[PDB]
Amino acid sequence: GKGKPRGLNSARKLRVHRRNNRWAENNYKKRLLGTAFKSSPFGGSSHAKGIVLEKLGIESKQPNSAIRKCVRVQLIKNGKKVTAFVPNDGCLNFVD
Amino acid sequence: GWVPVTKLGRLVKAGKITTIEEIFLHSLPVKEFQIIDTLLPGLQDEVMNIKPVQKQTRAGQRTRFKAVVVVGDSNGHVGLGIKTAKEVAGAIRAGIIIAKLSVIPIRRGYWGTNLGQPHSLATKTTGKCGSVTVRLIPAPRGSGIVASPAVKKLLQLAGVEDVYTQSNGKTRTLENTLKAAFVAIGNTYGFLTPNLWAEQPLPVSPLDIYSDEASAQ
Amino acid sequence: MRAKWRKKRTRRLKRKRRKVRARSK
Amino acid sequence: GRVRTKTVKRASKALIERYYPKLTLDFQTNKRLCDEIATIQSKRLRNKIAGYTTHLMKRIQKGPVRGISFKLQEEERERKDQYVPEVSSNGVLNVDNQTSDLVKSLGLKLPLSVI
């Protein structure tokens, strides 16, 4: 039983099932598709440099309530205009 | 100033029975807890967990506490109690009493050739309590216990030194994790072994031997 | 909404999409 | 309703259990009996107890109660149980065919008959 094959010669079938279900996996699909290059805001790199275009105070989500004080920046190497939250208190007073 | 209430209690108070070895041996029912109060001095406890359960009533919200507490001396006997009570203190107290009622023997073994007072389990063992399968693998000397903190403290109370502990299912529920480990430690003597293959003369029930110290007053 | 009526909605939407895509040569 | 409670009912069953021959069938006599032979803190509650006692006494004289028994009832039941008639020949044993085959294969004498 157990639904899979168990014959001594079914390595091909086992291998191919594994290869077909790794796509139903999540993180493996992203790795092989290569979203970190073809689509992601960064080029898959760990950091990225930008030019501060504008400063957006955006309201948080419920049930909280606050302004979050981020900056709408544009990446230098790609050209995707993203939004970067700013860390601890006043750092928006620091970023022009 | 405890007084015995049952036949077995009469015997253990009259000191004619002095070993839970013999109690388990004859699979006698431990109805009082004072008997092992006598029969396992130095028996230390450990309150594994306290958690609130709630019932949703007409107007209010009836909260009571379920306390899970393990007990053991340190050498080959453990018991586990669960209790539900309106207050945490009474909960722990009655949990200790129920644990002492449910003390159970564990069979320690070797991971290889026998040398100096078995350290580990006798065989791989498994216990399942509602979707939590705790499995215990023997281990060589000096490997210690490798398990979750709760099962590790429980097996440490049991006295097994070296155990490999697989696990499966939603272990996050400590009640069921400890219940599973308890069924595993029971299945320890559950298993039959080429050592135990031999024959015995089937001992003769201290109830039946001392029946006269066992009648009423 | 009910899965059956949602299916019928997406059916009519698919029909309209096909129609405009066919009008677009 | 006039549905008397466990206090009076248990008290009445017990007093009839331990004072059956002294108790009587009259309400006033039973009442005074309770007065002298009970420590009860109300004339009203005593009257309720005594009334249920007379009622139970009537149904006890008419028949047995499922609830309570006395020394007298215990004695008469002892003897009624001890009665024994002559045990269960009419000649040979009764109708038996395959059980007769049983007794032949088992090896008895057993004067019996056919069926």
Add this chain to the structure above:
Amino acid sequence: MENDKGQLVELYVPRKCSATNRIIKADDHASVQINVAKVDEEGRAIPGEYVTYALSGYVRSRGESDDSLNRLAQNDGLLKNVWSYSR
């Protein structure tokens, strides 16, 4: 379960069932020990003498305790021709 110097360990030895020879647990509160009488000549079952049997909870619950008792009693001579080996 002895140790290096041939010395015994394993704090106690369990009693094994007499129907299937399976270990009778400590928590098997269904496990039962029948003690029949050794009868000397002319009735008068001498007190203090037991032909001991140990029946397990599994056998008793599955309901073959009477079968196993009949077989064991005949095997130890307690009965004469109540249990047949070939059903």
Add this chain to the structure above:
Amino acid sequence: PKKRASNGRNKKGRGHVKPVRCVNCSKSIPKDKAIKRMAIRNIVEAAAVRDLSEASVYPEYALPKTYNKLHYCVSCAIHARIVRVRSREDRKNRAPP
């Protein structure tokens, strides 16, 4: 879950069975379903039997009957109280009271 092991009403090996129509609401309910009852009445109920016998020719001839087989949807069955919602443990009972 599965409120009933017989899946509501008994098929167990057909696959399809022709449906009948309820008698109150006329709803096409399968025939294995459709609470079925037998109405065996007299035409001339004892509210009027003696009247008829008093006023009738053919002395003591007979009294005929009306036989009807009623099929009921489950909705109208419960509504007209031919059947009632039972306890979870007495659902398994099949015998007719």
Add this chain to the structure above:
Amino acid sequence: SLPATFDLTPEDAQLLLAANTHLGARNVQVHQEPYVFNARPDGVHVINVGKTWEKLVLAARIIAAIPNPEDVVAISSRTFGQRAVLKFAAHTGATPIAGRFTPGSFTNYITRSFKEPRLVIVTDPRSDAQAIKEASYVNIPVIALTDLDSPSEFVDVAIPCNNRGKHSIGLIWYLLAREVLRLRGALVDRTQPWSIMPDLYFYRDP
């Protein structure tokens, strides 16, 4: 091993056959096929009285050898077994539980009915199935006057008698009492019969 004085004794065989104990029920319950001897036509099954008496003497040898012979407990919930158990109890120790059982009477050490026996005897296992279960919980043998279509679960030694006649039930109780007394008891000379009549262990109308 049991000496040749302990055979069926055609007199007791007459008693059994006259009380009509050899009759069973129409359903066999294969766990009792050994005890069945033959199938009577017109749908009746004939219990083997030989095995009946042998199992009775075995059960008597079990009911003896209890050092404090009162700690035997004898249960009966039928009507046809109540006077039987009362008289059996009166003779041996055998604390009787007649009528209803008040369950939790072997566990629950604080009840007033809390017996803690080392053996039980049940007249009808199907209707005393609560006492059977309690004995299961607290580790106790069973000696039961079972019928053929009687549940053999959690029952130790069984005596197939009738469970459908007054005479069968009472007379099996009577013979068991006699045999347990004769095992040591005080009834010397097994070859001499017993004075007490089975009418004692019969239930009047009343």
Add this chain to the structure above:
Amino acid sequence: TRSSVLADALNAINNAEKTGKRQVLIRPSSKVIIKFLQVMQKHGYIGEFEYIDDHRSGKIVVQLNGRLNKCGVISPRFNVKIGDIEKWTANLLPARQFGYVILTTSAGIMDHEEARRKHVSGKILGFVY
């Protein structure tokens, strides 16, 4: 259809011993079944098996004695080398001292201790304890 007569024999035996039977009628038989039972018998896990010889394939009646916890088959019959015998033992036997892995070597059907001694290996068959 019947694919692994040995697997079915061992499964019948396991079921009978779990039920608490004393003997079991296996069908059909085979040389590998006879040899497997012989290994078991040598180590003490079963009693006596009587091979009823009808003309077709034979049947076996195996009088047990308890003391056999679980017998099973490993299918397919993987090729175990002498270095991987240990991995198999450690993966499907309870403790390092009892219980036997049963290989099918070119020296006959044997246990894993006999296998380590004669220093041969081959197709794994099953296991007993």
Add this chain to the structure above:
RNA sequence: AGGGGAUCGAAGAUGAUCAGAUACCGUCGUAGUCUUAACCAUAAACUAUGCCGACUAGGGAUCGGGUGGUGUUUUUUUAAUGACCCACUCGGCACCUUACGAGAAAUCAAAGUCUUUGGGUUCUGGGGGGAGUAUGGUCGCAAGGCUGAAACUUAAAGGAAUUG
């Protein structure tokens, strides 16, 4: 496409209720409902339970077949026959009790013989939405079928049972 078109009846028309009522209720009625010749190819197409094989637990019914009975009723004198009864048997659709086991539980003699994991084999699933969507393919007269993503967003969604 052709025939036939009684009944019921999508659409539609109208009457009432309603705050409204493009609906429920009421009268009418088109396609349809039926058949022949061709298409489609999906359904809660359900036993939400793949097919083959082996073993494990009792019980009573019942359908088809088969064996046995110095059994019951039947012709006209009792054989044959038929049907019924009893015991068993093979294959079925199911059913009653237990939990021996399994399960998260509801519950299951198969959803058992699974941590003491391996009888053979096919297909499918990998948190919820977007989504059975877009697109490309292929089949179809068409409706549509099969195949089938992503960008993005989210900490839940869900199953079984308990107390309200």
